[PDB]
Amino acid sequence: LAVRYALADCELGRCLVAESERGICAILLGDDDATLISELQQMFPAADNAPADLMFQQHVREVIASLNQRDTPLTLPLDIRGTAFQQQVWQALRTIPCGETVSYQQLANAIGKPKAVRAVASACAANKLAIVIPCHRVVRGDGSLSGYRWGVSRKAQLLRREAEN
Numbered sequence: 001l002a003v004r005y006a007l008a009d010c011e012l013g014r015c016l017v018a019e020s021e022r023g024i025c026a027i028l029l030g031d032d033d034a035t036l037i038s039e040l041q042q043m044f045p046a047a048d049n050a051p052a053d054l055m056f057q058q059h060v061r062e063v064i065a066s067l068n069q070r071d072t073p074l075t076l077p078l079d080i081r082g083t084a085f086q087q088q089v090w091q092a093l094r095t096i097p098c099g100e101t102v103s104y105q106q107l108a109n110a111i112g113k114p115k116a117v118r119a120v121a122s123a124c125a126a127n128k129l130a131i132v133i134p135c136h137r138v139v140r141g142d143g144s145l146s147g148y149r150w151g152v153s154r155k156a157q158l159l160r161r162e163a164e165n
Contacts, residue, residue, distance in 0.1 A: 003047035023077030029150040071098040089123035096137040103141035
């Protein structure tokens with residue numbers, strides 16, 4: 001269960017990158033370290049920083065690069081943890097093209113459960129891999145940018161950079 005983490009600056013502000021032995025297991029965004037670290041401790045409790053792990057620090061620099069660019073895919077291995085339903089929702093987020101948004105209902109319609117709009121909504125707000133799993137791309141259909149796990153200012157910022165020119 002070993003989980004390593006680092007804190008770095010990025011265009012969206014402060015982020016925490018975390019890595020287990022399977023791959024990047026959390027990418028969290030925020031304004032202050034205390035909160036990122038307890039947020040991470042909530043899901044991965046004895047997670048520790050690893051400043052001298054040369055090989056982890058490289059991976060963090062790779063993850064940051066994706067994070068600051070408009071459409072740079074994260075190649076490193078992902079450690080996606082969740083239920084079949086969450087996994088189905090997150091896998092379908094990843095097929096949303098950079099520059100488009102789908103509403104919760106369209107997403108529920110696309111995965112074969114027109115009925116489960118609420119649960120799809122919840123699956124998006126439970127994403128632990130900011131940006132890499134593009135949960136900023138799903139919107140409630142009414143024109144509002146609510147529902148993002150890391151706030152309206154970052155959701156809005158992300159959508160504005162992908163819908164460019």
